């Protein structure tokens, strides 16, 4: 809200000071991904 105004009990994030003093917002977790990465294992190397 904004004291001394008619804007009261509005729901949302105001863009005036979003960080609110914090150095950074952090979120932890894991994640798995598929890829088509290249390899031989171990062919195309010299015969010896």
């Amino acid at each position: 809200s904004i004291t001394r105004t008619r804007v009261s009990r509005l729901y949302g994030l105001p863009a005036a000071n979003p960080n609110n003093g914090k150095e950074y917002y952090e979120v932890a977790g894991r994640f798995s991904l598929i890829s088509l990465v290249p390899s031989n294992d171990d062919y195309q190397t010299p015969i010896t």
Partner: protein
Amino acid sequence: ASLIYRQLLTNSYTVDLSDEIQEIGSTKTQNVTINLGPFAQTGYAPVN
């Protein structure tokens, strides 16, 4: 006149160094390990 046969058989070791000469004179070429192997019949994900 069998001295040709006898001397050929005796001096047949010279062929090895003659081959050495022809080898160090000729060009060189080496191949790599190659795979025929099993290869998977892999398509793409179903996309939209």
